[PDB]
Copies of this chain bind each other. A is one copy, B any other.
């Protein structure tokens, strides 16, 4: 298989592939696509109960520079992901409005190559 998955704590990016790898870590929560194909992304955002700062609650999934998903509901643990045909050089990014909006001991996301 080719899959990777960022989070949750105590972990960060972890990966499983053959050679060559289909994807590659770019940084926390962010990943780069090295092989064209059919990818299921998946993951869940569990909002943090206590959060009380000014910033509104929103979590954003990016495909490169484009938002591909928004998470607005601040009480449901929500699912992130979907089936995406991605191309080389493609990035993917989960981006929380505050850092403390979210329970990192329990929030994360990941990716699996399904086909070519």
List chain A positions with a Cβ less than 8 A from chain B.
1, 3, 38, 40-43, 66, 68, 77, 79, 81-85, 110, 112, 114-115
A38 / chain B contacts, CB cutoff of 8 Å: 3, 40, 42, 110, 112
Pick from B66, B68, B77, B79: contact of A83, CB under 8 Å:
B79
A38–B66 Cα gap in the complex (Å)? Answer: 26
Assess the A115–B3 pair: CB atoms within 8 A.
yes
A3 / chain B contacts, CB cutoff of 8 Å: 38, 115
Copies in the complex: 3
Assess the A83–B81 pair: CB atoms within 8 A.
yes
Pick from B1, B68, B115: contact of A115, CB under 8 Å:
B1
A79 / chain B contacts, CB cutoff of 8 Å: 68, 82-84
A81 / chain B contacts, CB cutoff of 8 Å: 83
Assess the A84–B42 pair: CB atoms within 8 A.
yes
Shortest A87–chain B CB gap in Å is 12
A115 / chain B contacts, CB cutoff of 8 Å: 1, 3, 112
Shortest A13–chain B CB gap in Å is 16
